[PDB]
Design a protein around this nucleic acid. Sequence first.
RNA 1: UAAGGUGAUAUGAACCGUUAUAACCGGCGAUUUCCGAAUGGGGAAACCCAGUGUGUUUCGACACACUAUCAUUAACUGAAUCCAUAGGUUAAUGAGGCGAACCGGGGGAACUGAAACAUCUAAGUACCCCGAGGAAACCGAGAUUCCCCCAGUAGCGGCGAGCGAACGGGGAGCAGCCCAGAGCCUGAAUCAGUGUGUGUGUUAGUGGAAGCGUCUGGAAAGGCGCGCGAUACAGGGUGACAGCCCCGUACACAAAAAUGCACAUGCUGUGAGCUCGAUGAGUAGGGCGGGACACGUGGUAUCCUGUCUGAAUAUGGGGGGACCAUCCUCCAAGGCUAAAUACUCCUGACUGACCGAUAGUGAACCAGUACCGUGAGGGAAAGGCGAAAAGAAC
RNA 2: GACUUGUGGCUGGUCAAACCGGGAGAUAGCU
RNA 3: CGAAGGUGUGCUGUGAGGCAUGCUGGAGGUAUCAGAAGUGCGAAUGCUGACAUAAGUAACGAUAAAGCGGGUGAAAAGCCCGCUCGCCGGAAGACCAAGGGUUCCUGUCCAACGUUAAUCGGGGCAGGGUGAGUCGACCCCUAAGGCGAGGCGUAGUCGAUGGGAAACAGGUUAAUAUUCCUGUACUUGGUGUUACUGGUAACAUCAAAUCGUACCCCAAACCGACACGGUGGUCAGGUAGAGAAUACCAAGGCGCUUGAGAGAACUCGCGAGACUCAGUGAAAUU
Lengths: 37, 90, 60
Amino acid sequence: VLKRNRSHGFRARMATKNGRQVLARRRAKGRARLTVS
Amino acid sequence: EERLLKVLRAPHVSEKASTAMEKSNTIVLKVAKDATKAEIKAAVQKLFEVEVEVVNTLVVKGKVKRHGQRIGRRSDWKKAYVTLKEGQNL
Amino acid sequence: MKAKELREKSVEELNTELLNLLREQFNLRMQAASGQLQQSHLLKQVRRDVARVKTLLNEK
RNA sequence: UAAGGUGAUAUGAACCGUUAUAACCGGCGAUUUCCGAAUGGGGAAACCCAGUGUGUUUCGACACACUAUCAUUAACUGAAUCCAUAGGUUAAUGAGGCGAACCGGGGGAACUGAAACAUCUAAGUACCCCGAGGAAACCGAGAUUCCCCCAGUAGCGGCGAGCGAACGGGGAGCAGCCCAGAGCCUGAAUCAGUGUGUGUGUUAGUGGAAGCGUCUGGAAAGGCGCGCGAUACAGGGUGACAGCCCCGUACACAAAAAUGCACAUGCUGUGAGCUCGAUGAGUAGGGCGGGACACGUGGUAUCCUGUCUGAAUAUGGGGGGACCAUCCUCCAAGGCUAAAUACUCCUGACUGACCGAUAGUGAACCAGUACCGUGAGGGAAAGGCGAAAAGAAC
RNA sequence: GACUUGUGGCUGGUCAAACCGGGAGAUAGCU
RNA sequence: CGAAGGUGUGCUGUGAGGCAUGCUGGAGGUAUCAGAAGUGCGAAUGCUGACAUAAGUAACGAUAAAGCGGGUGAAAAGCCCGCUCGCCGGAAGACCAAGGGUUCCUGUCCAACGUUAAUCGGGGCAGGGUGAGUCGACCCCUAAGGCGAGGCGUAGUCGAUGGGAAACAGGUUAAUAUUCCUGUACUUGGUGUUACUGGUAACAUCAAAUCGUACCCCAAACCGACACGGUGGUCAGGUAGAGAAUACCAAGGCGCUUGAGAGAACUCGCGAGACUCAGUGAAAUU
C-alpha cells in the first residue's frame, strides 16, 4: 500500500508518456482489477 | 430546512440498543453518509420534539460476503447514539 | 397528477415540495424500517412525486 | 395502438388501469455525485482540507457561479529607458482525451537460399512518436492522382539470385476555376450561408385477403376426398415436418421536432458581358566553406543553397522519344479543385456446395472468468432444462 | 558509542540490459 | 403398424463396404448420374477428458505426558466441563506499529474447506457494525534532505516519532473501552454583568469538523504443503546477589495437530523411539 501504489499504481503511469501506453492495454482488456491498491 | 429532513435513513434496533434504552436512555438510528454533529442534533429537536445531550458520529466499512462465484461488497453507513435526558417519548 | 402543479407559483410549489419531504417521506421510511408499513407502494409514489415537483422547480 | 404492466437471471408476497392521466417504442426541455485528460493545493482511479466575491425569516450553518497554462483579436494599464517592447487584469472564439484499418512526414533491425566476404535481395519493412484528414499524397498533346494496359518489357549488377519506367491503344463510373481590372456600368448571370411555407425522401407505428370436418393416436404441422388463396411460398418460432391457427409481406394513409437533393419572395454577399492593356525580378549563372542524393570529393549529371555579392525579356533557358541550326508554344514570388477507387470497432435489412460446445473467436450463460505474478505481458473448464415445470400431498 | 530506525543523492562486469507481445505459426536438409 | 446413429446376429461381395431384422431409443432421413475438402489413424516423452497394476501397502514428521470421572447425543478412542503434583513460563506470554478488512462474540447446521475421527471449530447461513474537543495527530510554522517562475541555486511556495492549551485512577460487558452515569482537576474564543486602567481577574451561559479504532502482532487465524528458517521496537517485579548467571523455575496466559498390547541389536537417559496391529489413506517404475 505504502511502497506499492507509489510505484505500481494508476497515477504512476499517467505522469509520463511512456506509462500511458501501459494503461492503454488495460482499456482494451478490461479486467476485474485495473490496478492494485 | 430540507437538509435536516434527509439526514436520517432508518431506525436501528438490536439487542444492544434495548439494554442502554432502559439504563442510560440512549437510542441509535442509521443516518446518511454526511450529516455532521450540527445537522443530526438539530433534526431530533424538531422531528422527535425532544432534547438531547450529545451526538456521536462514526463510519464503519461495509462487509464483504461470498455470494456465488462473484465477489460483492456493500456500502458504508454512519450511526449515531442519540443520548436523551430524563424524559423521553419514543 | 402532473399538470395540477404546473400552473403553481414558485413559492407555493416550493412549499409542497417541502411538505412532501418532511411528511410522507421521512415518516414512511421510519415505518418501513420498523416494520409497521403494511403497504410499500407509498414510498414509490412519494418518491416519484418529489421528483416530479423538483423538475418543475428547475424547469420554471 | 388503449382490454394490459412494474427489465432479465427467477417465483411468491405488495399496487395501478375498466365509456379513457397504465406500461413499452420515437421526437422536443429541465434535471444530469466524490473520483479518472480534472485547472484551488497536493495526491493512492473511489484517503484528507475547498480559496475569493453577493443575496438570504439563520453576523454561529448550506447550495450555485469564477480563477494551473500557451497562442490569436479588441479595449485598458504599465519598468530598466524620453518613444517602442516584456509582465499583470476583463470579455469573446478556438482545444492538452482514448481505442482499429489505410495514407503521408520526421528516425530506424535480426533470422531463411547467400561457392566464400561489411557487395545485394528480404526491407524506405514489422513496431513506436507528433500532427492532419474522413481516403491520404522527328507522326501528336502542357490540371493532377488511382484502377484497367504497354510489362515479369526496352535498361541496370562480380550482367549470381533479385529489385524496377513511359507514349500510343483497348475502357470516360472527370465538371476544369479565381487574382494582378483602371474606366463607361453594381444590390447582374452563375452559386453559397442563415429563416419561414409547399411538394418529393430518410429515421419511430397502425389497418391488410386466404383450411370448416372425419379415421388412427394422450396430443396433429403429415395421409384420403371436396375448396379458397396466390403483386403475397424470404427465413425462423407457435404440443410431430405449418401459405391460409399466430408473429412478418402487396395495396391504401398521417407530420408537433430535426436533416439531405431541384424550385416563389426578403436582408448581408469575395463578384459579369462589350471596349482600351498586360501574361509572373533578390532569380538563373559564377566564386568561398559542409552534408544528404549507391558512389569514398571521381571521367560526374540531376536535386537542396546559411553568411559576404550580383543580369537580361526572341541579343537569355527547357521540351518536339536528348550533337550544333529553324518556326510555334512555354520561360521563376498567387490562390483552389467533388464523387468513384482506400478502410469495417458500432446499427438495420439481405446473402452461403462455412461451422454446430476438444469445432468456431480467450470467451454462445455472471469470459476480457476463477486462479497466479511487485507491476506489465501472457493465460482454463462448464448449456445438450421438459411440449407444458405436471419439480413428489400422505 | 564502529548500536539501531526513516528519507534522499553517488557507483551497471547476474536485478551488471531478466520474461511476455510484435518480427515469429520464422529459422538446424540429419535426428 | 416406429427414422438415422449406437448396440447383437444372419445373408451377400476375390478390393475398403453396402442392404435387412430384433433389443434399447422416439424425431426429420436417404440412394443413382457429378463436383468441391478442415477428408478413413496403432505410437512423434503428441495435446484434452475419463480410468488400472504397483497397493487397501509404505507413511502417523523442524518434538512436555498420556490415563481416570461427569454431562449432552442413536453412536464419545480423540472434541466440551471439573480436582491434585510435575513438563511450557524476563518468554513457545501480553499490549502498539504492518499485511489482511468481519478470521474475534452468540445460535443453528455437517455436503464442500482441515494429512484420521471431528455432534467441536479458525467451514456455510442467520443474529450482533467497535461510544471519543481532554484515545492516537490532522491543518499550519521550523532543521537536514527536495521542489523552486527568471538566470544556467536567490527571493518564495512546502515538508516531523521533539518543541506545540487537557485526565493520573476506579466501578459498569455475554463480545470491544481511558469516553456515557458518578466524584475531582486544568486551558483556549464570542456574548452578558462586576472590578481595574480594548487588555487583565472573578461568576454564569452557548458552540467546537473529518479519518483511524475489534480479532491477529514472534509464529495457530498472516507469507515458503510438515514453525524440512527469516522475523523492527518498548517494560530486566518481590526475596537473595557485585551484575542481566545461579537460588523461591512465583503469578498469569495454560498444559505435542490422534489409540491399545508386546518392549531385540544399536542409540538416548523400569521409561522415551523403531518393527508387528482398529479405522482413514500415496507416489515413482512397468
